[PDB]
Amino acid sequence: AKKTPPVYPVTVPFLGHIVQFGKNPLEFMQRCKRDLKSGVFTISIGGQRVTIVGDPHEHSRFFSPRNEILSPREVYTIMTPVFGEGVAYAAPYPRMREQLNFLAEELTIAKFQNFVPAIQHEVRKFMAENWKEDEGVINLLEDCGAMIINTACQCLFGEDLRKRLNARHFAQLLSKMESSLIPAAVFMPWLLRLPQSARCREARAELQKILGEIIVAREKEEASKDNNTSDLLGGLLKAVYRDGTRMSLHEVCGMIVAAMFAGQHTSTITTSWSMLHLMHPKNKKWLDKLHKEIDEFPAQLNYDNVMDEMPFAERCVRESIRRDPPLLMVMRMVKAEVKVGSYVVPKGDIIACSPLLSHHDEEAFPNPRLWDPERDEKVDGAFIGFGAGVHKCIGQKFALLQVKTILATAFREYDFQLLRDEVPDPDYHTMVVGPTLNQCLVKYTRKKK
Numbered sequence: 001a002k003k004t005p006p007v008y009p010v011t012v013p014f015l016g017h018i019v020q021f022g023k024n025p026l027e028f029m030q031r032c033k034r035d036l037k038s039g040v041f042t043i044s045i046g047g048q049r050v051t052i053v054g055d056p057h058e059h060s061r062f063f064s065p066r067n068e069i070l071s072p073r074e075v076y077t078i079m080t081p082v083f084g085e086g087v088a089y090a091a092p093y094p095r096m097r098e099q100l101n102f103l104a105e106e107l108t109i110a111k112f113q114n115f116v117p118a119i120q121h122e123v124r125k126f127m128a129e130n131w132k133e134d135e136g137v138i139n140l141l142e143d144c145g146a147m148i149i150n151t152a153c154q155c156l157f158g159e160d161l162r163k164r165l166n167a168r169h170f171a172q173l174l175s176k177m178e179s180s181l182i183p184a185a186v187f188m189p190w191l192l193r194l195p196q197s198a199r200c201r202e203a204r205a206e207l208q209k210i211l212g213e214i215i216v217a218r219e220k221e222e223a224s225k226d227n228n229t230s231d232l233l234g235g236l237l238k239a240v241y242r243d244g245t246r247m248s249l250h251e252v253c254g255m256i257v258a259a260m261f262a263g264q265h266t267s268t269i270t271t272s273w274s275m276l277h278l279m280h281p282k283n284k285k286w287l288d289k290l291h292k293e294i295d296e297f298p299a300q301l302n303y304d305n306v307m308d309e310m311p312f313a314e315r316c317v318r319e320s321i322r323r324d325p326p327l328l329m330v331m332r333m334v335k336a337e338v339k340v341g342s343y344v345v346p347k348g349d350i351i352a353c354s355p356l357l358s359h360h361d362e363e364a365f366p367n368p369r370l371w372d373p374e375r376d377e378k379v380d381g382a383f384i385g386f387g388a389g390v391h392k393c394i395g396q397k398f399a400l401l402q403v404k405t406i407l408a409t410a411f412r413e414y415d416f417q418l419l420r421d422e423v424p425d426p427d428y429h430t431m432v433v434g435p436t437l438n439q440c441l442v443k444y445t446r447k448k449k
């Protein structure tokens with residue numbers, strides 16, 4: 001407009017749109033976009049301009065520019081004490097970038113050969129421990145939460161580390177470290193100034209020492225040559241920066257935390273929703289097609305099995321992520337002016353792009369609330385559940401590898417029944433959204449012949 005996108009009327013100032021938003025971000029966001037008559041628009045939040053990019057045709061405008069034009073650092077300040085100053089965003093873009101590459105090289109399909117069997121074993125344990133009986137009632141959001149942390153550690157943690165730490169203890173440190181997070185923290189740069197840092201630094205420093213000790217070990221076993229291991233930790237130790245330096249224990253600790261928090265809720269939600277959708281009677285044909293896919297697999301899967309021969313199960317997981325994205329907003333700080341469609345975005349704005357809003361556009365996704373694994377985006381790029389462009393998730397392959405394997409293992413040895421009429425409602429209260437906890441009670445039936 002030789003100017004900014006349309007602005008949205010504030011009835012009660014100094015809050016902005018903070019209240020109807022928190023209740024239902026989706027109901028709210030859709031209202032504006034229609035009423036504004038524009039898929040792109042600014043909202044006020046605490047006197048802070050927030051322009052949401054909600055016309056799928058424009059995602060490229062959001063995801064393509066460099067960090068110097070659209071900076072992620074600022075919206076993500078709420079992460080530094082969980083990762084450490086100078087790690088991830090706190091770290092400067094050259095080194096932040098460097099760091100992500102390290103982690104990236106650890107999560108590549110190269111290192112995934114032992115992963116598919118490692119996952120099968122660790123899921124199969126859990127089932128025998130908690131799904132003991134012929135029939136029972138468990139909470140799926142909680143059981144997934146535990147299977148996810150279990151198999152990931154089984155994958156990315158070395159035997160020595162997993163001995164002197166277990167999944168459950170580490171998960172309890174994830175909860176301890178994270179819970180300092182309030183969603184509405186990222187929208188007042190004074191609130192960086194805790195009744196919770198002083199449990200966060202304790203859980204980190206407990207962890208960072210433990211890892212330090214673990215490193216003492218491996219070195220005084222290197223000349224000994226007892227074993228060969230290349231886990232995420234060991235991978236990061238061998239890490240060398242461009243300028244020949246290496247990661248301090250603190251950076252390394254944070255990166256392992258960052259990797260682990262990163263995947264923790266997102267994929268456990270993802271696994272849950274998928275399970276929820278599939279177990280529903282409205283969705284049997286899909287479960288049926290799911291079975292004609294996992295039916296002539298042997299009880300022990302290889303990397304080939306999940307990767308190249310489960311294409312339909314991939315669709316289910318993506319549709320779950322499409323329908324109910326776990327990260328609703330992705331955000332940047334508009335350091336410089338960027339043109340969006342027929343608008344401009346002024347230096348100083350907060351530009352956001354919402355997987356939640358986007359996945360709901362009717363052109364791109366007809367019946368957006370209908371779960372359809374065979375659906376395909378009808379605008380190209382509509383789906384941004386793993387983000388896009390410069391910042392596409394690096395955990396995508398891994399997340400899918402887990403979830404596909406889990407569904408397959410778990411639907412091979414069980415049936416399921418939702419103790420409800422309708423699939424859970426998304427709970428929009430957490431910074432990472434999943435299905436409502438208290439609705440996820442489900443009843444398993446151990447398959448037999």
Ligand code: HEM
Nearest residue numbers: 262263266267270327330385386387391392393394395399
């Ligand atoms: C289904 C599970 C997951 C979902 C839905 C998901 C979603 C996303 C999204 C939306 C972004 C982009 C955020 C942005 O644009 O600012 C992203 C980036 C990322 N995710 Fe994930 N993620 C998942 C799993 C994981 C896992 C398992 C890891 C680690 C192994 C991980 C680590 C990352 C990293 C490092 C980025 C990089 C963003 C950047 O370049 O700064 N995620 N993910």
Ligand SMILES: O=C([C@@H](c1ccc(Cl)cc1)c1cccnc1)N1CCN(c2ccc(C(F)(F)F)cc2)CC1
Nearest residue numbers: 076088183186258259261262263266327328329431
């Ligand atoms: O921690 C992450 C990333 C992530 C970035 C870097 C690294 Cl090294 C690891 C993880 C993330 C979290 C979960 C899955 N994938 C990436 N966040 C945390 C901040 N995020 C976020 C989520 C929601 C909101 C809010 F409140 F506006 F809706 C604002 C920010 C989404 C991205």
